[PDB]
Every structure is written in C-alpha cells, then in structure tokens.
Amino acid sequence: WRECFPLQGHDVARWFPGHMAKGLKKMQSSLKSVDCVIEVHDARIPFSGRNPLFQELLGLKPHLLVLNKMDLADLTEQQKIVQRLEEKGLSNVLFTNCVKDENIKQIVPKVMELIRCSYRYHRAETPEYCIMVVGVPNVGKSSLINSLRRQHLRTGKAARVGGEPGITRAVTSRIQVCERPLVFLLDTPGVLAPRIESVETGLKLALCGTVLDHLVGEETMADYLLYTLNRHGLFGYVQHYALASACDQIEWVLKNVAIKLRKTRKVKVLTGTGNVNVIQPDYAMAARDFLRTFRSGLLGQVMLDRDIIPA
Amino acid sequence: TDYFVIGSGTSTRHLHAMVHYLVKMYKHLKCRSDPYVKIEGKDADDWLCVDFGSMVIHLMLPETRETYELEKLWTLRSFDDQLAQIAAETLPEDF
Amino acid sequence: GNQNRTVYGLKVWRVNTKHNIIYVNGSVPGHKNCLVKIKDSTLPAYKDSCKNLPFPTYFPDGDEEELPEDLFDESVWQPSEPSITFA
Amino acid sequence: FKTKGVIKKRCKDCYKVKRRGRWFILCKTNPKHKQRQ
Amino acid sequence: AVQKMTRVRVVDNSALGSTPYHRPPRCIHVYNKSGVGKVGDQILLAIRGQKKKALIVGHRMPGSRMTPKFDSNNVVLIEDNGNPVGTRIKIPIPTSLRRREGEYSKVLAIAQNFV
RNA sequence: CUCUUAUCUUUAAUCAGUGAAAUUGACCUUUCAGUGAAGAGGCUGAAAUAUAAUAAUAAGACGAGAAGACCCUAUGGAGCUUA
RNA sequence: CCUCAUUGGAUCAGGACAUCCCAAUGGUGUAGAAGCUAUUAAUGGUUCGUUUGCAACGAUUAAAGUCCUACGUGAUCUGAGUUCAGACCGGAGCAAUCCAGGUCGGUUUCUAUCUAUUUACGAUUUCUCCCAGUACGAAAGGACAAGAGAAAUAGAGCCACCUUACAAAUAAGCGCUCUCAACUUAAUUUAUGAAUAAAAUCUAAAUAAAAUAUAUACGUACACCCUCUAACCUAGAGAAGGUUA
Ligand SMILES: Nc1nc2c(ncn2[C@@H]2O[C@H](COP(=O)(O)OP(=O)(O)NP(=O)(O)O)[C@@H](O)[C@H]2O)c(=O)[nH]1
Ligand SMILES: [Mg+2]
Ligand SMILES: [Mg+2]
Ligand SMILES: [Mg+2]
Ligand SMILES: [Mg+2]
Ligand SMILES: [Mg+2]
Ligand SMILES: [Mg+2]
Ligand SMILES: [Mg+2]
Ligand SMILES: [Mg+2]
Ligand SMILES: [Mg+2]
Ligand SMILES: [Mg+2]
Ligand SMILES: [Mg+2]
Ligand SMILES: [Mg+2]
Ligand SMILES: [Mg+2]
Ligand SMILES: [Mg+2]
Ligand SMILES: [Mg+2]
Ligand SMILES: [Mg+2]
Ligand SMILES: [Mg+2]
Ligand SMILES: [Mg+2]
Ligand SMILES: [Zn+2]
C-alpha cells in the first residue's frame, strides 16, 4: 500500500520555453491598456503552480482569480478554500467550468464592481473596459475567452482551444467579449515559473496537464496517480479497468491495463548473452491511457492539495 | 589474496586511527623493496579498506559489517544466503 | 608523405650478431625494406651514455673476445627460458 | 606594492628610493606602506 | 566502450536495479577526460528517475590480449560515499580491477567470481 | 552523430579526335604600415623579388551572372474598389 | 493623441591583453588549509548536453576568459529574419484592401582569368604515490619544495597483435610507439657600496647574484649533381624519384 511517494534523487520540472519568455515581455508592455488582470487556474490545484511573477510583475493592476475546471474536482470544502485564500490576500475568487458554462455569468459583474473601486488615470476617459487573462498552460485560459464570448455576446468561439499545452504562443490582440459593458480580453501564453518550488508540486502540476508529460517521462507520474488515487480512497480504476482488486504497484496495474487494451511492443532487453528483442506489454501506453482517463474525470473527483488547504 | 581480514571499529574516528597506524608501521616495518599501499574509502565514513600485497584488511562499523556480511561470503563461498537469492532468468516473448 | 622524419629515444632490446639485426622499441618511419639512419640518441637524458659502448666502433677483426650470437637486455625474457611465474 | 600615480609617505619610518627606473616608498616596520609609481 | 546515452545492465542484487522496470538504465556522464568508458571507469546513470553513480565491470568492446570480453556492458551501482549499493555480485568480474588506479577493493570484496 | 574508414562505378588525371559559355579599358597584374568615403596590386614611406609551366584551395579583385530586395521621384502607367 | 525595425550554427580560424586556467611574485584583519587584493606574463589550452528563441537549467573541468577581424569567414555549407505570389483566424475599412498583430506553405546560379596560398622539428595539462596525517594547529583540519609512477589531449609516425573492410599480397582506427635542450627577462628578492659623518641604501651610481611566459644563440633533419630503350616500384594526377646477378 506504500506510505510516502519516493522523491529522493528526482529532479525538478523545468520547461520554460523561449516563447514563455518573449511572451512575458509583451505582457509587460501591454500594462498600458489593461484595467484588470484575471488569473485562471485548475480547481484541482488551489495552492500550487501559481507562477509568482504574475502577482509580482502584474501586481500593479487589480487582480481576480478564477479557478477553472471545477467539474472534475472535489469541492466539498470549497468554503475552507475561500477562508485560506482570504488569508493569502485574494479577497475575490471564482470557480467556473468553461465547458458547461458554470458560474461564468458572475465574473463580469465582479470585474465591473472591482474596477469601480480602483483608479484609471490615463484611461479614465475611455469607455471600453479592457481586462487581461493570464495563467499556467491548460487551465482553460483560452476557453474562458470563448465561454464569455458566447455567454454575453452570443457570437461564438474566437480563440483556438486545444488539449495539449502550448497552443497559444504570443500575446494576441483584443477579443471582444461583451457589448453592454463593452469588455475586451487580451489572451496570453501560459507561463509556469522559471523555477517550480518542490519536486512534488512539479509532479502535481503535471497531473492536471500543465506541463508536457514527456519532460517527466510519464512513468514517474503514473505511479503518483496510483499513490494519491489509493491514498485519497478513490478506488475507481479497478472497476473502469476491470482489475482484480486494489493495488499500489505500477508494474502490476500497468500490466493489467496493458492486457485489457491489447497493446504490446517489441522491446530490446539486454540479457547476459547479448541484446535480444522480445515482444512485451506496453507499459508506456498504459501509463498514457491511465493518465488520460484521470484527466478526463472518469476516474473520479480529486483534491490533489489536501491537508494543505485545511490547515 | 592469501589472507582476508575483517575488523570492526568503535567509531569513524577510531577507524581512521587504526588505518593510519597500520600504514605507518607498514612503511617502517621493512617493505623497502615492496611497493606502497593506498588507503581506500576515506570518502566513505564507515568502511575503510586497505589492500596489502598478500593481505586485505577491511575495517567497518558494526552496522555496516552486519549489512554486508563479508564473513559469510568468504567462509561459505557459494552457499551464502544472500547469494542464494540471486537466481538466473531468460527472455521469452509475451502472448 | 615521402618526407624525412626522425624518432627519438628508442631502446635497443637485443642485437643478433650473426645476422646483424637490431631490435628497436616501437615503430620506425618508412616501409619494409626501407633504409634508415641509426645513431645514438640525442635526447638530454642519454647525453654521455656512449662511455660503455665501443667508442670508435666495434671491430670484429680485433677479436678481443668473441661475442654471443644473441645479445639481450636484462629485462628481456628470452625464449627457451622457463615460463614466467610472478611468484 | 600598489602601482599608483602619486607616491606619498605614510609614516616616519617610510623612506624613498629610485630603483629600476621607478620611485618606491619602502617601509620596513609596516610593509603595507609600500608603493610603486 | 561506454558513452553518453548507452544502455547498461546492473549486475548487483540491489533493489534499485534488480527490480524489473520497462526501461533499462542509460549513462548520463562518464567520469574521464576521455569521453569513452572502459573497465574500471565510473559513470553516472539515469535509473528510474534517479541519478546514481556506477562502475563499469565489463563491456562488449575488445580490449588488450589476455583480458575477457563480455557479451553485455556490465555495471555496479556505488553510493555517493563510494560504498557499493548492492551486497553481492554473482557474475564474473575481471581481475584487472585490482591493479587499476582507483578504489576497487570494496567491489572486489563483494564479488565471488573472478575471470 | 561520437569519428570516421574500406571497396567498386561516375567524374577526375594522362594519350588520341572534335570543340563551347558568361566574361575582358589597358596591364610589365607583390607584402606591411599609412592616407582615404567602412574602402589600395597601382598613391606616401619601408620591405621583398631569376624566368616560365602542371595539378590543387577559394582570402581578395566592394569577383561574374538573372527581369531579385529596400526607400524615394515623375503634374509616367495599369489592375481593383467605391460613398 | 499614438508609435517602431540584420543575426545563430558548421568548417578553418588570424590577432589584442583590459589574464579564465597553467607559470613567477608584493600585501593581508595571510597560524595551516581555504581565500582576498595588486604587479608581471599572450605561453598553450579554454567540454558535453536539455528546454529553448533569447535565455533557462543539468553534469563536468586546471579553466569552461573578455574582445577585434564588414554575423572574421554564404564564388566553403546551413537555419532564421528582412518578406513578397496561396491561405486562415484577431482587429480595422462601405468595399478593394490593410496591420511593423497571430499562424501554415513556399526555386540563387557560377567551368577560378589575376593576386595570394598548398613539404620538417626540439609537449601541454591533470590525478595518484612519497615526503606525510608530518611542518602547523587547542582541536577541527591539514601544507611547500624536492622525488617516482600513471593517464588525457595535441604533434609526428607505424601494422607484430586486435578490430573493420577489400569475400587479394593492402588501407584504416577502435590498435601500437615516440616526444627534449634555453645563451638571452619582469614583476619581485638578496649581497657589496657612494652621493649622504650611517655599525645606512638591491644601483634610471659604478657593481655581484637569483628569479614567469617567451626564443633559436645551441642542436637534430636535409646535404650526393646525378645513367636511363624499357620493365618494375611500399614513389607518383602528369612530370619528378627508387630499383635492374
Ligand atoms: N473538463 C474540462 N475541460 C476543460 C475546461 N476548460 C478547458 N478544458 C480543456 O482544456 C483544453 C483547452 O485549454 P485552453 O482553453 O486552450 O487553455 P489555455 O491555458 O489557454 N491553453 P495553453 O496551454 O496553450 O496555455 C481542452 O482540452 C479543453 O477541453 C473545463 O472547464 N472543463
Ligand atoms: Mg584532347
Ligand atoms: Mg610581376
Ligand atoms: Mg593598408
Ligand atoms: Mg610602394
Ligand atoms: Mg590540363
Ligand atoms: Mg577568389
Ligand atoms: Mg514635380
Ligand atoms: Mg498622370
Ligand atoms: Mg587563434
Ligand atoms: Mg598584462
Ligand atoms: Mg565570400
Ligand atoms: Mg569552385
Ligand atoms: Mg490573392
Ligand atoms: Mg514555413
Ligand atoms: Mg510541404
Ligand atoms: Mg512564412
Ligand atoms: Mg588556380
Ligand atoms: Mg611533492
Ligand atoms: Zn610606513
């Protein structure tokens, strides 16, 4: 059943491509014309990832946090999350599901009311309220543009929404979202951090799909699912994958998953008499499918940051 | 080697003292034609090994001696319990 | 290629007096059946080592003492000797 | 020995010499006081 | 000859290697001024997300006459302090390791068979 | 790729036959420092220096070519759209 | 009231020194060991990767210097960009079209006429051993010079073995061998001794020494005037050169 995931000797998750650097320059130059800044994030990870530069660099303008992907997360203790987020200095926080337009109406009134309290100086005469959305990759940041684009303007998708990280590269032009308040949105590429804090946060930050999985291997991460999935008690993979009984060993579960999916490779193994190519079950493919089921929410709702939020 | 010697030591400090004394005596005690011997394991904090021309001495702390069990291997050349657990395998296809 | 080159500090391991053969450590420039120039080494270490060697030259006509057919260096293991056992 | 543009004595014991084309202040008591032009 | 990115066979009984894992270990660094690794040369492996030191005890490339050429590139895992990770080695190890400059007595003690 | 290697064919090279092309102010057509417009085989001052081929390299002759690029000009055009 | 657009790499590198390592020294809040600062010196060297479009890291190293040569170098090669003919989104405009906003796609060729150039050298660095776990130091810890041995790289060669070829008598490296002397100096340190009554003072006073990197004084290599029908050659594009009971 294991006790604690081994994290000794593993390295941190460094992704930080060049576009996440040229991008950060454009975002800084765009402060001129931004009334408010919106941070999107993954509801499953309330207190991790969270590129600190956004508060640092973009702290000049008022801020609003929008925890996305709430549908595939456990929000029983949502009240608790707010209490601590209040301690962090994030008075206003929103939970929204982009795909099924949950709670997305409330965002615009709060942005309106939030702006009223602040000053506008050079832009005090402009009648168009332009705000800006930032966050780590694959948090629904581009989707949020479309969900509001339709909810209010009832027009249609305007930003390319994609599963894998890195779809939106550069800081784009404004995208009109509403007509009555005349609210425009600036879409920007996902930035993680120059240096994630801990090996675990970086491991969690890959679970939700924020960083390309091959940078972590997809084998030191599938193991993490089994640990937390069993630890948190969500024994759903057994039924979904028709496993014999609960287990806490990747080599065993991935052996079962691979057989179920009828996937095998021809892999070169090195024995004592010389290299030999032997057909074997796809441990790699099972890890992907095991990861891709979790992320799709069919394995259950999770609260990866638990016992960190309560405290 | 002709002779294999294993001796436990109280602490890391004691281990260094014993190794240094033996090497000092070794140079003094003749061996004028015979070459010199290195002290190995100084980076290690619990196990030091000095290999003379025909004798090898390993000095280690009690726990290190218990884990490695050098005595059993050399006493029981092929019947050591740890060795027994190491089996052989082959590589057949999966069907 | 086809240039004059010199190799420095090659040891002499053995001399065959009957066939006038010299055994020189390592490689020598040129192809087989190529003529070479042999002279005492000019390196600093062996500055005045020709004290022991025949100073003008080796005269066989003098016949002061008749040389063995094969001359060896002490470290050399000669064939027909007992097999080496590093006891 | 610091190579400075102006040489100035710093204590009573410091003395001056003209060696190898340059001016030196050399102090036996305090070697810190040594300067070259 | 072992280089960067070579695939290696851990010949200990240590759990780090012994445990069957879909990926073999791959060399990340060779501790030499020459990039190549031969018998007795340490290397840094990437084994199951972990970076671990190791020592080469045999390889498939030919060597000088009277030395044994193995059929697999054999390696032993050593701790950072230099003590071997595993406690036993049942595969033959060449006797050249004794005289090579370095610390090999600890590994030789753990090895029962010598070739 | 580490880190290249060997062989064969093509081409190359030598012999025989046939025989183009862009290009070309004149040339008895050197190196260094200076001067100069980013600039010198040719100017200033030092220096070097028997004469002609054959086979190689491409630093230079701001090397040679094409209807290439870029900005601006004309009381020069043309296609397209309109309110 | 707003604004905004040549440079990487590969190959081969020439040079500056404002020195990153290697070498010789002054000072210290330099006990030793680690360091800090400055002088002197251009000697050879100054790694491999990952994400990258500029950085961001990993593992090493004695060190991974800073610059100049029209990105040093495209008639040596290559990726961007400038930047277009097609096409989409976002934002403009009544439209055609447009944006120094995104993106995907997307043809520069050259036979070298001239200059210039194409046939030797006398080695750098690192680790281990010893001195010696000593000198020093309360302990912790822990040297220098002197001396011996290993490799790495570079340069020059070779084929007995090994390996890979020609399913040839050969060529290669993944194999093997060899690599050194310093007359001449700079920072700096001594000895003798005047200007200057010293039992002072290293001296752009007369003097005597020691002391980096450099280098060619000093060596090795070369050295012969050379028949040629032709054949042969471990010599070669041709010519040249070697060999011929
Ligand atoms: N289940 C679920 N999936 C969502 C939700 N919002 C977005 N997604 C998923 O997330 C992906 C889209 O991410 P996107 O909206 O482009 O976000 P981004 O952060 O702007 N992308 P990038 O990584 O390029 O920065 C798709 O796989 C989409 O289905 C949501 O509320 N629920
Ligand atoms: Mg002809
Ligand atoms: Mg002329
Ligand atoms: Mg000039
Ligand atoms: Mg002139
Ligand atoms: Mg011709
Ligand atoms: Mg030219
Ligand atoms: Mg006009
Ligand atoms: Mg007109
Ligand atoms: Mg150079
Ligand atoms: Mg200097
Ligand atoms: Mg050119
Ligand atoms: Mg050409
Ligand atoms: Mg068109
Ligand atoms: Mg393209
Ligand atoms: Mg195509
Ligand atoms: Mg394009
Ligand atoms: Mg030519
Ligand atoms: Mg010494
Ligand atoms: Zn003074």
mmCIF file of C-alpha atoms (C1' of nucleotides) in Angstrom, chain G residues 12-13 43 109 141 156 176 181 190 212 229:
data_model
loop_
_atom_site.group_PDB
_atom_site.id
_atom_site.type_symbol
_atom_site.label_atom_id
_atom_site.label_comp_id
_atom_site.label_asym_id
_atom_site.label_seq_id
_atom_site.Cartn_x
_atom_site.Cartn_y
_atom_site.Cartn_z
ATOM 1 C "C1'" C G 12 39.058 26.937 -40.555
ATOM 2 C "C1'" A G 13 40.436 30.254 -37.526
ATOM 3 C "C1'" U G 43 52.601 30.522 -23.295
ATOM 4 C "C1'" U G 109 23.475 30.042 -60.183
ATOM 5 C "C1'" G G 141 41.509 20.033 9.997
ATOM 6 C "C1'" A G 156 54.850 13.146 -35.569
ATOM 7 C "C1'" C G 176 50.818 0.299 -31.341
ATOM 8 C "C1'" A G 181 67.575 21.476 -24.639
ATOM 9 C "C1'" U G 190 69.093 39.327 -1.939
ATOM 10 C "C1'" U G 212 57.463 33.646 -15.325
ATOM 11 C "C1'" U G 229 65.455 1.946 -74.619
#
